[PDB]
Amino acid sequence: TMFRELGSGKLPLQIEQFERGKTIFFPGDPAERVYLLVKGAVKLSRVYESGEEITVALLRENSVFGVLSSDRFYHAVAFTPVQLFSVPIEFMQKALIERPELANVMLQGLSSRILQTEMMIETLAHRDMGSRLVSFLLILCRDFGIPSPDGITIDLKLSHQAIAEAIGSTRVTVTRLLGDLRESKLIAIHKKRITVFNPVALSQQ
Amino acid sequence: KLPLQIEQFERGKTIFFPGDPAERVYLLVKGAVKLSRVYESGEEITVALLRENSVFGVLSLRSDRFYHAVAFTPVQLFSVPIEFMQKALIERPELANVMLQGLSSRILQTEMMIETLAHRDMGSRLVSFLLILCRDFGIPSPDGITIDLKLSHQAIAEAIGSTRVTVTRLLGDLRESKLIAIHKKRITVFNPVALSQQ
Numbered sequence: 417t418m419f420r421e422l423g424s425g426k427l428p429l430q431i432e433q434f435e436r437g438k439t440i441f442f443p444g445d446p447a448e449r450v451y452l453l454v455k456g457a458v459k460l461s462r463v464y465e466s467g468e469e470i471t472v473a474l475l476r477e478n479s480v481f482g483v484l485s486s487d488r489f490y491h492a493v494a495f496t497p498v499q500l501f502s503v504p505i506e507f508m509q510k511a512l513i514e515r516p517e518l519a520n521v522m523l524q525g526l527s528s529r530i531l532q533t534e535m536m537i538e539t540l541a542h543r544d545m546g547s548r549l550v551s552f553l554l555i556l557c558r559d560f561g562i563p564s565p566d567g568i569t570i571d572l573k574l575s576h577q578a579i580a581e582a583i584g585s586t587r588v589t590v591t592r593l594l595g596d597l598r599e600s601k602l603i604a605i606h607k608k609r610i611t612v613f614n615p616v617a618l619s620q621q
Numbered sequence: 622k623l624p625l626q627i628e629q630f631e632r633g634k635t636i637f638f639p640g641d642p643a644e645r646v647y648l649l650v651k652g653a654v655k656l657s658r659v660y661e662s663g664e665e666i667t668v669a670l671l672r673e674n675s676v677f678g679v680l681s682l683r684s685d686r687f688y689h690a691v692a693f694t695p696v697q698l699f700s701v702p703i704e705f706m707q708k709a710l711i712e713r714p715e716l717a718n719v720m721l722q723g724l725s726s727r728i729l730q731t732e733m734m735i736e737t738l739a740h741r742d743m744g745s746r747l748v749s750f751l752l753i754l755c756r757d758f759g760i761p762s763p764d765g766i767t768i769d770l771k772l773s774h775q776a777i778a779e780a781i782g783s784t785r786v787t788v789t790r791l792l793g794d795l796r797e798s799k800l801i802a803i804h805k806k807r808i809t810v811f812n813p814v815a816l817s818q819q
Contacts, residue, residue: 464736466817472732483725519710519717526724527680533731534668538660541738541782584739619662 423515430502434494437578441482443469443491449502451481452525456498457559459582463489470540471582473532476559480525485509495582496572539583548583549593550621553603557615566604567613574608626700632771636690636698639665643684645700648723649675652696653757655780656727657689665689666738667780669730672757676723679703693780694758694770737781746781747791748816751801755810764802764809771806 420427430449434440441447443463458475474495475481481492485505503511512519539551553570561568576594577587585593594610597603602618604611612618626645630636637643639659654671670693671677677690682703701709710717737749751768759766778788792808795801800816802809810816 462732462735466736468736470735470739472735513714516714516717517711519714519721522721523680523710523717523724526721526728529728530680530724530731533728533735534658537658537668537731537735537738538662538664538666540735541666543741616661 434498438494440492448505450483450508452501453479454499456496459493459495461491546593547621552583566611569611629697630692634692639689643679645678646706647678648699649673650697652694655691655693659687675727743783744791750781765811767809
């Protein structure tokens, strides 16, 4: 209603909620609708000509996905429970003409995606899995961090497998690596909540 | 009034350093740019081999100063100040489009660097980089595709995040295995798909 004034055109608004882990769209599906992440985080990954599926970005609130305008190599899954708005590609293509300042809303989405993808670069470039885990955790911490007495706690319930799918590891490797981190007193875990302290210090790994 | 700045850089020259004031939106017009980022760790990692029509510089609008841009080939660049772009994005709609297209191209090129850096074995990383060069700079030759570039082993090493020594060794291995040939700094990949093995 307040978002309606931008435009004021009839809006084909599609509101959908997803549970943690559910796929928002699969690679290959036409997936025409452009999307707007209103609550939560989305794990976006790409399928390359090899067949390898690599994570490319943990999108945060206000990020925009599905704005191709061939492709269709992208898989989107709800990293947390997510709430999404989507409008079809046709409406956007026309509205970017009619509604002119919203080019800016587009740039902000695209700019954000760039930054987010650059943060996956620094993660996936690590070679050693433990640094790669450490790198992903800090991403999660900046997006989901809460000042806890012991340090910063991600406010999230994280599957070990979900972390593995992000960093390109296996759940067992991830479970062992987190344990190493716990044993060395770099982190603490309670009921699927992970806490870190000296986070700039934690990168040492 | 369009305040266009046209500038040319030679192969290897840095277009701007990390920490330099960033006050300017750049459009690649000819050539390729190696865009890299210096992260809070202090590490400088390649984030994209940009391609013509790609956009770099201040995109956020305190402008981020943590990029390094180098001309991977000789490059010709267009630039306008960021303030001009701030107003022109709303006023002039047809170059909002140049912005959207360029960022989208940069995103795709960054994803191609993701698939390269993630491999964790230098040879796969090198193979991935060579294939990106081959599609972008490839020319038909009797023996397959020749990257139409003169390449310093140091250049490849910086891009894929390796040492020069490691790169020279891996190119030696590819040559010994008869996957590539090198002649006067030009590399010919015989069969890219079979190169994609190993």
